[PDB]
Amino acid sequence: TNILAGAAVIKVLEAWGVDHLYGIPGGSINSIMDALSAERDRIHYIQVRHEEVGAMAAAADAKLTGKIGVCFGSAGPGGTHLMNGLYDAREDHVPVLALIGQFGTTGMNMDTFQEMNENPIYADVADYNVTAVNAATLPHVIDEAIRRAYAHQGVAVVQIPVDLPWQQIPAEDWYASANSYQTPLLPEPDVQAVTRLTQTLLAAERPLIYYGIGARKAGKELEQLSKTLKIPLMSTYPAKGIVADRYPAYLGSANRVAQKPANEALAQADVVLFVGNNYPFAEVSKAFKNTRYFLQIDIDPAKLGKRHKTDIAVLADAQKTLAAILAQVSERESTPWWQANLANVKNWRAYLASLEDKQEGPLQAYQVLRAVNKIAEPDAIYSIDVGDINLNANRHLKLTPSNRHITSNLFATMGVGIPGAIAAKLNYPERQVFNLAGDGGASMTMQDLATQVQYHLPVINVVFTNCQYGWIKDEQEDTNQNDFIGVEFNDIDFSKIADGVHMQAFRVNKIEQLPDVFEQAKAIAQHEPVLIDAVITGDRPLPAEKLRLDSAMSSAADIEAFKQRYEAQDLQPLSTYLKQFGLDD
Amino acid sequence: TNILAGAAVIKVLEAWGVDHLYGIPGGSINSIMDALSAERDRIHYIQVRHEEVGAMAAAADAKLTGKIGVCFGSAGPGGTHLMNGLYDAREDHVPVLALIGQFGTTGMNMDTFQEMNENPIYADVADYNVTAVNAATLPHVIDEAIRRAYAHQGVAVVQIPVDLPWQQIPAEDWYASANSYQTPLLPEPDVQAVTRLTQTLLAAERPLIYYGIGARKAGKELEQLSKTLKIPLMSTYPAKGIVADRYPAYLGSANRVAQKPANEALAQADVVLFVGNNYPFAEVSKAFKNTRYFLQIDIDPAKLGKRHKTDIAVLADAQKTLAAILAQVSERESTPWWQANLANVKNWRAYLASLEDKQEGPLQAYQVLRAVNKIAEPDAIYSIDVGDINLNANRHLKLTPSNRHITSNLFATMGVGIPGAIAAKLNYPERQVFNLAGDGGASMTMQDLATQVQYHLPVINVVFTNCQYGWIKDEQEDTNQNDFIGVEFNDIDFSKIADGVHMQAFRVNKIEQLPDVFEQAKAIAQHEPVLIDAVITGDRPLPAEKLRLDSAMSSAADIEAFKQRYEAQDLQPLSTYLKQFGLDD
Amino acid sequence: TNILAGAAVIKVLEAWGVDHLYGIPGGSINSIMDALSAERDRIHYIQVRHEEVGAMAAAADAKLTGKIGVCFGSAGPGGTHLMNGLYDAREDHVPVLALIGQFGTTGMNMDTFQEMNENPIYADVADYNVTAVNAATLPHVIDEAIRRAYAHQGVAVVQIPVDLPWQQIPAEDWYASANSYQTPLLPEPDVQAVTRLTQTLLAAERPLIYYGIGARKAGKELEQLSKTLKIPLMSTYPAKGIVADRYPAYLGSANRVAQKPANEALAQADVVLFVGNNYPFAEVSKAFKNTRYFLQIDIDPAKLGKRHKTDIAVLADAQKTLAAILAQVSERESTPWWQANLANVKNWRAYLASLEDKQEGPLQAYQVLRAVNKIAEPDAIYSIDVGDINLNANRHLKLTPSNRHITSNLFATMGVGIPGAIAAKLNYPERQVFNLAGDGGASMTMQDLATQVQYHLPVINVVFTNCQYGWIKDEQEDTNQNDFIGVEFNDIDFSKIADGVHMQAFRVNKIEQLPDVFEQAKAIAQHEPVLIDAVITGDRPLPAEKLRLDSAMSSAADIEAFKQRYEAQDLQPLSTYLKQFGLDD
């Protein structure tokens, strides 16, 4: 006849297909805990060691599977600890439900222990942000929160006074709307607009197709269009892997987490097809200042003409539109622009290989990533933290459509490596999972290495120990007048941290040590987590946004200093290849 | 003729006497970093490993010295990481300035990398919350923020677009108002009201004086009034130490972080003098339901009649008022109420001593704290985390007016032990400093053990490893119908964590191991930090709020179960002593 | 045994002495209405015609009496209509309680009719901002709101779900803390700081005392210090009347709502004693750019050194400090500085009198205000709207300590004239009350002239009809490159509007009509409200901030143009008087 309101809430989560959720208990959320306890055969609670890891893992769940992530925090400090993960979910536009403990309705507004008005705390981050005040409507409020988080691709927060889930409600009244769920409709491309777009693209002297993760379903069409039309491809960093890295006309990404060929080509291009792309550097870096025609395909009307004035804009699904272009074109002959870019890519990849292929000496980030490549399975998943690792992984990882990689794309919160890998292994127990993190980021969430141990999640953790916030040191080098500050710090031995949480680990500092240690790690991670602490040099990775290679643009002295510092003696500027094929810079 | 606006900002901090500040750099705050770098001889930047530790340490600075604490975080995730420390500062009403990075005014509102409207993030926590938009007024905005944080005893947040501090401003225009600073005026007690208050207090059959930290300047007057009038003393937990723990009529604190004699006496009292006290449990625990007359002294009109209806309310300084009462009274003879309470205290202290005085066997929290007492200097400072340690430290630490102790009093954020100890050692390098933390709380901020190492801060860290969130397990025992959940977890060896950050450490699990390890730690902390990981039992500490000792109130079976579980065979209920002296319960 | 929670809420209001409150009913607040309906003998509900008028009137109640003002609005649009009054109360730092309707707890968060999360709406304006969720604690929440509004001198907002006030609660539990309310007894002003401040003031060659409303209790001391020491007085506009306008050495106020002698003298002064003053134009107008020493007295630490670099800032009560200064000084002979300022004031007053004393012709604001003066009782209260009326009333009204005048000082919301006058008459039925308003501001709240009729509040309304937003037209003349826009509009005949709400009224457009109309109005307002619609010219009043009178500073052409436009042929610059008494400019 009756059900506890907390039991009904957990049944709402189950109806929506929530497999696992994260948090840390407290008095203010013990009634939800009680309902979870009864339901442990059907829904799986993951106890983290810091609530930010719970929120970040919930975000990562949604990034990986498209299913809403769920986390919770107790009243006051439990909930405020969620913030970095909630902001990550907002900025990366993935659905997350966050439940926040609150003291009982009889004690609210009495200024009792750890009791405050919690609603204003979450107003900025959340698409939906409500304090529940009734037990009978609580299942509906949770249902509403989930349905909105999905529809609006963001964060729904519900503060729950602890008395409500222990109250009996009628067993027959509540329901979940999960059965009625659908994903948004995919708009179709206008035939005339697609034809006009195709004509402009074909008439270009120096075309590029520049796609983001909005094109994640269109890898085949992107590569086929590139091959057929002889048009180079470039992408946002997160869109690495949609087309295989091995594709010879994939230039990489632009700006800083970037590859040289992409920056150079973008500066020269006359027509850009900008597809499923919200590149946040467009305006500030003047990326498109010399672009003659700008053609955009996006599903979101809020994005059309956002990053540059459009000459043709198509409000449609990326794959449907790219298919429609491909359907109306035929094989084109090679062009000077095509060949110049192909040559430039070859030159760049030879540079990266030269760094990877060192066999002995002081360990650099480049060989560590080569060692990752050597033990990586074809469908491996990479959880990547924030800093130099984004740049280095972007250059060195050899990804295909079979891979996944995730980071904090836009909020760019450090510490996401560990939680992202926890979520990855929970969602894909049979797939190999890496956590690639700098020492600064790994330090921030280090305690949750214990969570990998506790739940026997065989993540391969690789920490890049430079004893610096390298990403920031390099920024200070570029901008600051006075000495470095706050960017060089004391060593932490992560192999000892790992030992502390009862995880097998290794520490290495020489290139020649890599093969055996990585082989051992590969084997250990068949059953248990493992950590490799790679002590790397303070060498700055080549700044693709600050090239000093072209004698028509840089002094002979700046060029040779750049070659020496970045081991880039064999790099040629794009202009070399443009000139070979009869085009001017 | 000109000065960089960032240089002027740092000069404002120097004028206000800021010695040290905390944070982690980033591109969005590198211009403030540049100004700090130039000023490193005069103001001292402390690089933390997680920004929440910076915010918590800033809060602790203000708790300890009364001087505004200063922290910062980079745009987006740097700033949102500050939240647990900022909420701590708000709820514990201490002045803190937080600077938040923001991207340059040319890139704001362009939806660029890690760029968002940051002002709404801080609206709830902050007394003052502004985004600076001009370089010439920036020193004033910082000055304003500091002056308001002090006057309003809370958090001032300023978001700073990174371009502004690198702009030149006239050298002669800016100023700091530090020279004009004063603390609020101390109101004087009305003579007639004090006399009426004194008469009511003297006419009481079962009086208590119940003080909080608002009486921190009135220790001498409190103890003297108690001795002269034969009136027992009780306090809030944070007010432990204002009167020496050894004082035989100090009952301790009420509720849960509490001592038995205080809970029992409060239930029986007819008149309570409530002084400098904002006890958050007053209403929810029905603390004063049987109190006949309620007399209050507080400096804040917002507090008068807040926690119970007052019969006499005095808007005045605690010390001035207590002095005025003492001036108009003379020595009173002993009473039955006085003797019953004295006997009860003796019985309770003998119980605590019996726990402390065990010499061998499985290690409990009680002997760990005895070992702390044995190596503690008379003016030691204690930074205490959140959980069972608050209860255990409250019972076992032997404090006097010469000590300081701090925790997160009201927000009660876990993880404060480490940052509180960092702040304590920075402010009091010649005083012994302890960090007393449970394993859950220590885990949350563990990475900043590295900060103690980096800045050579000789903190004595003591971790209470029960492999539980014990405080929460006990709550689930009390309230939950279904099995424990999320409260028992895997071991972390903190002696290995310490080794990882290059700190000397010990792990112990037997009572007989304590003396030598604590002696070694005492010696090490003359020069360097040290950590003791104390592996303790899962024994629940005696619940002072759930006594089962009085046969007129509890079954014989519940009483003997309580004695057995809490080793409390020799405890007597207050009623025993009331009856001895001819008073009924 | 039991009491309705709504009934207890009204008893809390009665305990705090709330005489009257304002609002408009709705379904979402009908349970509070129900409780008010039973208590008509003890609390007086005023039904307004627009909720902003209720909020503005509540703010005005507190401005006038120092007692908390109370208003309410129904859920959604009722509450949001309060905003202009709530912001006025926040900015003018007066205590106001606002009750906001909400739908019942069973329908909250169901997305029902007019149902939304109302808490974020009031977060910015409110010092205290909570949604009640329990009936038994509702009286406490209201009590807390009141106590906080008083303590923090601002707005407390409580959102009340409509079901709660109809729930029975135990009769014996609730209480109000009004009985605890008191004002603090302060120590004497800091003796050594006051002595030093005094020496600096007396050593000055060109001293000024510049006070604001913080000196409201110090009129006697201000005038005596001025006379004894030969130091001219100037004030903020709202501080007009604290010293009688007829005082020969009262210079007026500075900036734009200002008088010529104050602006001229301030520019010359070497030492300013800034007392109970938070002049918002200090920095932006560079008011103190030439000041050698700046001395301050203020009760609020947040203000110490806020507006200018301050040589000595005394934290103390204005009256007590000024009395302490007076007690340690004695007579100084007349100085050139004193004589020059006296002469300048005389010249300025002759100018104002020349405008007032016209007897025939096109009506100007100047003669209307002379007509007000001629019918004004010595203790009349003036509610003044926002625009040219602030400037003209500041110059022409002849106020003494027996008067009161109020406007929206800092938020400066138009429309306040009508509600301020309603509040004034409710608090002071036996005092004459004027509403002096421009046509723009009167139009915004015109419907509430019906409220004066409904409650038989004999306000004398005087509307200054120029068919312009004159204040803004003048700004456009000063700053805008293109034609006037939005500042000249169609006539509204307010005598006809008055007829429509059943109020006796007159319309005048000639100077010679004034005496008979104002005599009739004076007599009508012995019993009923009345309105005079004064059709005035579009003449720009003399801009005290743009003086062109001094041959050393302005071209002869500029001076002749200024003199012509502003009928200022007989005005002399201060430099003329300075030279006369042997001082240089």
Ligand SMILES: Cc1cc2nc3c(=O)[nH]c(=O)nc-3n(C[C@H](O)[C@H](O)[C@H](O)COP(=O)(O)OP(=O)(O)OC[C@H]3O[C@@H](n4cnc5c(N)ncnc54)[C@H](O)[C@@H]3O)c2cc1C
């Ligand atoms: C430390 C760090 C540094 C970084 N620096 C760089 C850098 O230098 N270079 C770089 O490239 N990135 C960088 N980033 C990542 C960067 O901040 C952005 O997140 C990224 O460039 C945006 O990628 P995106 O447009 O693919 O994704 P999003 O911003 O998520 O945009 C996806 C777009 O696709 C659209 N879309 C979605 N579905 C469809 C569909 N079915 N059909 C059509 N359109 C669809 C959406 O409406 C949206 O406009 C960095 C990240 C980090 C952590």
Ligand SMILES: Cc1cc2nc3c(=O)[nH]c(=O)nc-3n(C[C@H](O)[C@H](O)[C@H](O)COP(=O)(O)OP(=O)(O)OC[C@H]3O[C@@H](n4cnc5c(N)ncnc54)[C@H](O)[C@@H]3O)c2cc1C
């Ligand atoms: C895990 C945990 C559990 C806790 N549980 C308990 C518990 O069971 N029991 C317990 O007691 N505490 C407990 N607390 C602490 C608790 O939450 C409160 O912070 C504490 O009880 C309030 O102490 P207080 O009134 O001294 O301090 P505050 O809340 O800071 O109040 C100080 C008061 O003094 C007034 N004041 C300031 N200056 C003066 C002056 N010069 N003269 C007069 N008045 C002045 C202020 O206006 C204010 O009202 C716990 C804390 C933690 C971390």
Ligand SMILES: Cc1cc2nc3c(=O)[nH]c(=O)nc-3n(C[C@H](O)[C@H](O)[C@H](O)COP(=O)(O)OP(=O)(O)OC[C@H]3O[C@@H](n4cnc5c(N)ncnc54)[C@H](O)[C@@H]3O)c2cc1C
């Ligand atoms: C259209 C319009 C135009 C305006 N333009 C002008 C203008 O040109 N010129 C002008 O002068 N005004 C002008 N104002 C008014 C102006 O905006 C400010 O409100 C006013 O100048 C500030 O006056 P104040 O300092 O007296 O009041 P407040 O800002 O209320 O300051 C009071 C001060 O006194 C202190 N205080 C309070 N009690 C005590 C005490 N017991 N002892 C000591 N200190 C105490 C307070 O802490 C505070 O610092 C205008 C208003 C309007 C509506």
Ligand SMILES: COP(=O)(O)[C@](C)(O)c1sc(CCOP(=O)(O)OP(=O)(O)O)c(C)[n+]1Cc1cnc(C)nc1N
């Ligand atoms: C009613 O309040 P509460 O829930 O009892 C309280 C005091 O708020 C606590 S206490 C607590 C357990 C602390 O565990 P520890 O292992 O550090 O200590 P212990 O085992 O009790 O010695 C948690 C998780 N929380 C909840 C909590 C969660 N997350 C953070 C950041 N802070 C908290 N404090």
Ligand SMILES: COP(=O)(O)[C@](C)(O)c1sc(CCOP(=O)(O)OP(=O)(O)O)c(C)[n+]1Cc1cnc(C)nc1N
């Ligand atoms: C312009 O953006 P940014 O400042 O360059 C950026 C990307 O935001 C970074 S990157 C970064 C350094 C990361 O250091 P690591 O040691 O982990 O990596 P690395 O040494 O570069 O290999 C910091 C501190 N921040 C700032 C930062 C601070 N705190 C958090 C929680 N996240 C951040 N991400």
Ligand SMILES: COP(=O)(O)[C@](C)(O)c1sc(CCOP(=O)(O)OP(=O)(O)O)c(C)[n+]1Cc1cnc(C)nc1N
């Ligand atoms: C710099 O401040 P400001 O813009 O000069 C100021 C004081 O804020 C004014 S004054 C003003 C004109 C008032 O016109 P009236 O006809 O009432 O008066 P007047 O013609 O000047 O005698 C307006 C529209 N505003 C703007 C205004 C608009 N709307 C509201 C509700 N209040 C305002 N006050």
Ligand SMILES: [Mg+2]
């Ligand atoms: Mg690093």
Ligand SMILES: [Mg+2]
């Ligand atoms: Mg524990």
Ligand SMILES: [Mg+2]
């Ligand atoms: Mg007008």
Ligand code: NA
């Ligand atoms: Na951490």
Ligand code: NA
């Ligand atoms: Na209106």
